[PDB]
Design an enzyme around this catalytic site. Structure first.
Site, mmCIF file in Angstrom:
data_model
loop_
_atom_site.group_PDB
_atom_site.id
_atom_site.type_symbol
_atom_site.label_atom_id
_atom_site.label_comp_id
_atom_site.label_asym_id
_atom_site.label_seq_id
_atom_site.Cartn_x
_atom_site.Cartn_y
_atom_site.Cartn_z
ATOM 1 N N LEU A 105 2.127 -10.903 -7.398
ATOM 2 C CA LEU A 105 1.290 -9.735 -7.696
ATOM 3 C C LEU A 105 0.175 -9.715 -6.675
ATOM 4 C CD1 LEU A 105 0.871 -10.424 -11.496
ATOM 5 C CD2 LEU A 105 2.679 -9.170 -10.427
ATOM 6 N N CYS A 106 -0.287 -8.545 -6.300
ATOM 7 C CA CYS A 106 -1.412 -8.562 -5.367
ATOM 8 C C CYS A 106 -2.726 -8.928 -6.058
ATOM 9 C CB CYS A 106 -1.470 -7.439 -4.382
ATOM 10 S SG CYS A 106 -1.478 -8.028 -2.672
ATOM 11 N N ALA A 107 -3.567 -9.554 -5.278
ATOM 12 C CA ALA A 107 -4.924 -9.790 -5.751
ATOM 13 C C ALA A 107 -5.658 -8.811 -4.861
ATOM 14 C CB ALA A 107 -5.331 -11.214 -5.466
ATOM 15 N N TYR A 113 4.423 -7.308 -5.255
ATOM 16 C CA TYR A 113 3.911 -6.062 -5.803
ATOM 17 C C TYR A 113 2.598 -5.749 -5.105
ATOM 18 C CZ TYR A 113 1.534 -2.851 -8.978
ATOM 19 O OH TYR A 113 0.840 -1.788 -9.510
ATOM 20 N N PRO A 114 2.552 -4.760 -4.208
ATOM 21 C CA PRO A 114 1.328 -4.537 -3.419
ATOM 22 C C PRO A 114 0.119 -4.136 -4.245
ATOM 23 C CG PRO A 114 3.229 -3.436 -2.430
ATOM 24 C CD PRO A 114 3.646 -3.866 -3.800
#
Length: 123
Positions: A81-83, A106-107
């Protein structure tokens, strides 16, 4: 260390994975546990990249002792997952450096995810 770039996932593909977990895939949250206290995306595992960048290189038993879940098999697809910044990009690259050659990204950030209604997405 494959050259295959991670598969790009969208909000709906992540919402589908949260609602219907797939034993082939794992959604990896790379934020710090301090940030996960504000909101944890259900069905995710937390592997903080800043705190423990060599986490996915740990021995199996010590991985379970440090994180209190099983070290994912190297055939599982880890979807990061993006931070914000380059955290997820660094974690995916580190995963491939440890033999995890099936990866995704997941951008969207957690803030972006929650802004699109992800707060009430549940399995």
């Amino acid at each position: 260390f494959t050259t295959k770039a991670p598969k790009i996932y969208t909000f709906d593909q992540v919402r589908n994975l949260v609602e219907h977990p797939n034993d082939k895939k794992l959604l990896v949250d790379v934020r710090e546990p301090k940030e996960v206290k504000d909101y944890k995306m259900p069905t995710t595992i937390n592997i903080p990249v800043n705190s423990a960048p060599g986490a996915l290189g740990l021995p199996e038993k010590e991985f379970h002792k440090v994180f209190q879940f099983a070290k994912p098999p190297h055939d599982k697809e880890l979807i990061f997952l993006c931070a914000k910044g380059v955290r997820a990009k660094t974690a995916e690259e580190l995963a491939r450096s440890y033999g995890y050659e099936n990866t995704g990204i997941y951008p969207g950030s957690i803030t972006e995810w929650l802004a699109k209604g992800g707060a009430d997405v549940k399995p």
